[PDB]
Design a protein around this ligand. Sequence first.
Ligand SMILES: Nc1ncnc2c1ncn2[C@@H]1O[C@H](CNS(=O)(=O)NC(=O)c2cccc(O)c2)[C@@H](O)[C@H]1O
Ligand SMILES: [Br-]
Ligand SMILES: [Cl-]
Ligand SMILES: [Cl-]
Ligand SMILES: [Cl-]
Length: 396
Amino acid sequence: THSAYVYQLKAVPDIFDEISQRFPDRVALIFDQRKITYRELAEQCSALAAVLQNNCLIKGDIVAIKIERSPELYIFMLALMKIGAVMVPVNSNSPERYIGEVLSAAGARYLISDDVTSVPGGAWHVLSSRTLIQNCTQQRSGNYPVLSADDPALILMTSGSTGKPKSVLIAHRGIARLGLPVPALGNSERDCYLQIADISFAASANEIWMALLTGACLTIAPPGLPDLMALARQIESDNVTMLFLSGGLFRLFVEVSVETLHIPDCVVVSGDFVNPRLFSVAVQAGKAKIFNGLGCTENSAISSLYHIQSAASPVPVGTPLPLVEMVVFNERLQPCTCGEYGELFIAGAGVALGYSDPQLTAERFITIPYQGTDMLFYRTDDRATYDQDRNIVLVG
Ligand SMILES: Nc1ncnc2c1ncn2[C@@H]1O[C@H](CNS(=O)(=O)NC(=O)c2cccc(O)c2)[C@@H](O)[C@H]1O
Ligand SMILES: [Br-]
Ligand SMILES: [Cl-]
Ligand SMILES: [Cl-]
Ligand SMILES: [Cl-]
């Protein structure tokens, strides 16, 4: 099925199967000089999924992943999606104490890891990603679940503005929406993305799933902390065209090698306020399209984009991605006028299933009649308003 009804989204493995069948000879993954086509990637995902099912992993099992950046990492993500497991990606750069707190808060039953020696002990059962990969047979025949867009796919950790920790349950639809080409970016199967954001952060979905659910290429940064010299060579040598950056990596690049930012076609800076002067230096250094991007864990992935063009307050966060609705509501749950201040609320395909805390879920996921639809909204706790062109601007 390849439906032209853009709102009708499938579960992640179904979109990938469609993409891998349509672009089987396109390159899906690049690590160093190892390159993997969609055809080979789909074969490895099927074989691993069969292995995972024969290790009694089933739909709804909470499975943590601690695998350094590598092609195997993304083969495991796809295979766990195909069996309907709920992934809990773990920061490989985090101390063992914190990882155990993550897995206990997530309710992880299993921990798949590429280094079973450096993992915390607990109620979860540790599985070796290396031994699972070794056991992959040429037969990938399996009886897999019929997954829907609303089935859970991921558990990601986040914090509120005042530091309270929250466990967010993300549905397949929240990352499956990234298979829809974003008109602001003009992306397609011809693009190439750079995987640098840690898998424990929702921003990593921007890179992983916009690539693999569109037929584009994902080139994988080396594991560990960012090496800007290697990243610059990698951006050039693999022809990265869609570059997603945190505020730290963007600022550092503006300060030490701004020209690197103009090798890609589009550069998206998300995660926090950015000094507007940094945008002005970047915009004036080349013809790449530089965007201020808004995302939240509770909306799955990148949610809004604002293209910076000129010199003429914080930069707006712009207009929502496909299937995302953003509304600034005042204290009476009324849409705000231009210049009126309120709180940003987000609705549509990205909205998470909720928190592990049911009382917090009911506070922050509320249903509001809006434009004829009883719409489920996530309350961002971000103060905001509209500008003259209806662009959304967060004002902190
Ligand atoms: N351009 C921006 N300007 C100003 N403030 C921004 C911002 N972007 C985020 N914030 C703040 O961060 C909160 C959420 N942070 S998060 O860690 O939960 N998830 C992510 O950042 C994330 C998730 C998916 C994709 C992606 O690209 C990033 C949000 O509510 C705001 O306060
Ligand atoms: Br900054
Ligand atoms: Cl092809
Ligand atoms: Cl520790
Ligand atoms: Cl929670």
